[PDB]
DNA sequence: GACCACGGCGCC
DNA sequence: GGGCGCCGTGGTC
C-alpha cells in the first residue's frame, strides 16, 4: 500500500475509529480512505469528513450518523457488512466478517478502509448469480441504511421531568412491598438475588419447587413458577409486582433520562442492521423497541415519549402481518379467504375447528384460535398448549388436528420448507433472504426438533421483516418531501413525527404506503393513531 | 473500572 | 417459544 495525502479520490472506501460504538456520543478519533492501493489519512477527522460525499465502508451507516450530527448530510453508501449479512445472516460484525473473508479487523481508520475494499471486493464478487439476494441489497439494505441513519440522528423527544416524578413515587411503592415481603420471611434479605429468594421460598418456606434452571440447574424463581404458586402463598403475588416495578424502573424510568443527548434533548437509539438471524432489525443503547405498554405502569412510561411541541406522533401497526404473510406463503385458500373476507382470523378460525353453527357463542373458543395461530407460527406443542391454555394432552392433540383439517397447506408448507431446508441447508423469505439451519439432519430429536422450529419460522418472520424493511425505504423519501420524520420502528409497527398542520395528512399516506408496499395474496391491514405522546397516539 | 455467565423479563 | 437486548447478582482480572 502507498501512503497518500488526505484528499482522497472520488468514491473511496472510508475507514474510521470512533471513541466508542454509539455514533451519537462517540468522537471521530480518526478518518481515512482507500482506493486502488493507496491509503489516505486525514490529519484531522472532523474537517476531512467534509471532503466525502458519502460513506462507503463497514458500519457506513454509523459514520453517516456522526457526520449527520455535525451538520453534514453525508449519506451512507456501499458497505461490505451488509453484503455478508445477506450471504449469511450469521455474519453480524466486522471482526468475524473479516476474520472469515480475508482480513483482520483492526483499530486503524486506514487499515479499515483497506480492509473494506478488499472485503467489498471479495464479497461483491461472491455475489455472482445471486439475483434475489442482490435485489435485497440494492432495493432494500443499502437504501435503508440511510433511513436508519436519519432515524438515529433525529432522535426522540422524551419528557424527563415526568419520568423523574415516576421514579420517586415508584421507588416508594417498591419499598412498601419490600417491607411486606421482608416480614413474610420473618427477616429481610436482598430481594433481587434469585438465590436468596430460592433459599427463602423453597427452603425456609415449604413451597413446591416446580422446576430448575437451564445452565446451573438451581430451583427457578421464574414468573411462571411463581404464578403457579399464586394460590399457595400470598407473598408470591407481592413478589411478582416487585419484580414488575423493579424491571420497569431499573430498565426504563431511571436509565432513560440520562441518555438524553445534550445537543438535542432527545433519545438516540442504535438501529442495528446486520444483527438478526431472521433479517429483523434490533436496537441498541438504548433499545426503544421494548418500551413497556401492557401494565398500567408500563403505559405511564410510554406516555413519557412525546413529540416536539407544535408537532404530533403518528403510530402505524401492521395488523398481524406474520399470519397474513403465512397466508400468502402457505396458500391455504381457506386461510387467505378469512383475511380477504375482512374477517377476524381468531374468530373465523375458531368458527372452523369447532364446526360450530356460525361464529356465535364461543367466548373462550376465540381465546383459543389466537394461540393456535400464534402457535402454528412457531409450532407450539400440544403440551405447551395444555399448560398455557387450559386443556388436557388429549384435547391439545386434537385441536392441532382439527386446526390443520381447516388449514392443510400450512402443514404442507411447513413440511415442504422443512424438507427443502435439509436438502439445501437453508430456508428463505419471499424475496430470497436465507438463514442456514445445519442441525436439521441432527440425530438428537431434542436439538433437531428445535432446529425445525427455528428453521421454519424464519420465512414468515424474515419476509414480514423484508416487507416493513421495504416500506420503510419506500416511505421516508415522501416523508422528507413532507417535512415529517421517522422516529422509531418496532418490527411490525412504526412511529413518526409530523407537524400539527400536516400531521393527519401524513397518516393516511404512510398507511397506504405500507399497505401496498408489496401486495400479497392477501391485504396488509394497518391501524393508525395520532397523539402528543406514544401512549395517546393509540399505538 | 472493564467485562463475563446466568437467570429473569421487557418488546415484536 | 420464534426473534432480540438490558438488568442486578456474583464473581474475575
UniProtKB/Swiss-Prot annotation:
Region annotation Polymerase: where it falls in the sequence: 117-539
Record flagged with keyword DNA damage: yes
EC number: 2.7.7.7
Enzyme class: transferase
GO molecular function per UniProt: 5'-3' exonuclease activity; DNA binding; DNA-directed DNA polymerase activity; nucleoside binding
Transmembrane regions listed in the UniProt entry: none
Top-level division of the source organism's lineage: Bacteria
Keywords assigned by UniProt, alphabetized: DNA damage, DNA repair, DNA replication, DNA-binding, DNA-directed DNA polymerase, Exonuclease, Hydrolase, Nuclease, Nucleotidyltransferase, Transferase
Biotechnology annotation for this entry: Used in the PCR method because of its high thermostability. Has a relatively high error rate probably related to the lack of exonuclease proofreading functionality.
Catalytic activity: DNA(n) + a 2'-deoxyribonucleoside 5'-triphosphate = DNA(n+1) + diphosphate
GO BP of this protein: DNA-templated DNA replication; double-strand break repair
Similarity remark: Belongs to the DNA polymerase type-A family.
Role noted for this protein: In addition to polymerase activity, this DNA polymerase exhibits 5'-3' exonuclease activity. Unlikely to have 3'-5' exonuclease activity due to absence of a 3'-5' exonuclease domain.
Name this polypeptide is given: DNA polymerase I, thermostable
Organism: Thermus aquaticus
Organism phylogeny: Bacteria, Thermotogati, Deinococcota, Deinococci, Thermales
Parent-record interval covered: 294 to 832 of 832
Amino acid at each position: 500500500l502507498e501512503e497518500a495525502p488526505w484528499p482522497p479520490p472520488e468514491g473511496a472506501f472510508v475507514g474510521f475509529v470512533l471513541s466508542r460504538k454509539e455514533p451519537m456520543w462517540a468522537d471521530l478519533l480518526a478518518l481515512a480512505a482507500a482506493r486502488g492501493g493507496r491509503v489516505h489519512r486525514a490529519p484531522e477527522p472532523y474537517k476531512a469528513l467534509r471532503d466525502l460525499k458519502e460513506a462507503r465502508g463497514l458500519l457506513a451507516k454509523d459514520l453517516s450518523v456522526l457526520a449527520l450530527r455535525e451538520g453534514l448530510g453525508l449519506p451512507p453508501g456501499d458497505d461490505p457488512m451488509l453484503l455478508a449479512y445477506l450471504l449469511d445472516p450469521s455474519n453480524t460484525t466486522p471482526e468475524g466478517v473479516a476474520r472469515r473473508y480475508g482480513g483482520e479487523w483492526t483499530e486503524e481508520a486506514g487499515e479499515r478502509a483497506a480492509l473494506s475494499e478488499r472485503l467489498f471486493a471479495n464479497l461483491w464478487g461472491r455475489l455472482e448469480g445471486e439475483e434475489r439476494l442482490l435485489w435485497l441489497y440494492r432495493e432494500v439494505e443499502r437504501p435503508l441504511s440511510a433511513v436508519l441513519a436519519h432515524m438515529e440522528a433525529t432522535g426522540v423527544r422524551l419528557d424527563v421531568a415526568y419520568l423523574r416524578a415516576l421514579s420517586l413515587e415508584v421507588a416508594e411503592e417498591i419499598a412498601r412491598l419490600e417491607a411486606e415481603v421482608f416480614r413474610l420471611a420473618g427477616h429481610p434479605f436482598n430481594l433481587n438475588s434469585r438465590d436468596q429468594l430460592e433459599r427463602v421460598l423453597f427452603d425456609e418456606l415449604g413451597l413446591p419447587a416446580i422446576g430448575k434452571t437451564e445452565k446451573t440447574g438451581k430451583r427457578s424463581t421464574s414468573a411462571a413458577v411463581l404464578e403457579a404458586l399464586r394460590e399457595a402463598h400470598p407473598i408470591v403475588e407481592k413478589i411478582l409486582q416487585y419484580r414488575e416495578l423493579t424491571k420497569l424502573k431499573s430498565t426504563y424510568i431511571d436509565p432513560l433520562p440520562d441518555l438524553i443527548h445534550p445537543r438535542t434533548g432527545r433519545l438516540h437509539t442504535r438501529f442495528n442492521q446486520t444483527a438478526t438471524a431472521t433479517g429483523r432489525l434490533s436496537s441498541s443503547d438504548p433499545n426503544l423497541q421494548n418500551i413497556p405498554v401492557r401494565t398500567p405502569l408500563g403505559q405511564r412510561i410510554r406516555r413519557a415519549f412525546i413529540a416536539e411541541e407544535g408537532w404530533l406522533l403518528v403510530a402505524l401497526d401492521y395488523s398481524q402481518i406474520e399470519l397474513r404473510v403465512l397466508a400468502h406463503l402457505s396458500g391455504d385458500e381457506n386461510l387467505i379467504r378469512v383475511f380477504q373476507e375482512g374477517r377476524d382470523i381468531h374468530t373465523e378460525t375458531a368458527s372452523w375447528m369447532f364446526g360450530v353453527p356460525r361464529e356465535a357463542v364461543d367466548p373462550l373458543m376465540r381465546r383459543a384460535a389466537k394461540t393456535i395461530n400464534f402457535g402454528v407460527l412457531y409450532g407450539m406443542s400440544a403440551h405447551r398448549l395444555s399448560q398455557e391454555l387450559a386443556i388436557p394432552y388429549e384435547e391439545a392433540q386434537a385441536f392441532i388436528e382439527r386446526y390443520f383439517q381447516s388449514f392443510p397447506k400450512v402443514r404442507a408448507w411447513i413440511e415442504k420448507t422443512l424438507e427443502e431446508g435439509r436438502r439445501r441447508g437453508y430456508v428463505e423469505t419471499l424475496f430470497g433472504r436465507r438463514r442456514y439451519v445445519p442441525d436439521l439432519e441432527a440425530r438428537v430429536k431434542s436439538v433437531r426438533e428445535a432446529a425445525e422450529r427455528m428453521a421454519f419460522n424464519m420465512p414468515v418472520q424474515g419476509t414480514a421483516a423484508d416487507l416493513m424493511k421495504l416500506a420503510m425505504v419506500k416511505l421516508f423519501p415522501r416523508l422528507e418531501e413532507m417535512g415529517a420524520r421517522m422516529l422509531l420502528q418496532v418490527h411490525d409497527e412504526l412511529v413518526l413525527e409530523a407537524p400539527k398542520e400536516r400531521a393527519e395528512a401524513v397518516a393516511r399516506l404512510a398507511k397506504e404506503v405500507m399497505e401496498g408496499v408489496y401486495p400479497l395474496a392477501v391485504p396488509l391491514e394497518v391501524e393508525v393513531g395520532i397523539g402528543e405522546d406514544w401512549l395517546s397516539a393509540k399505538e
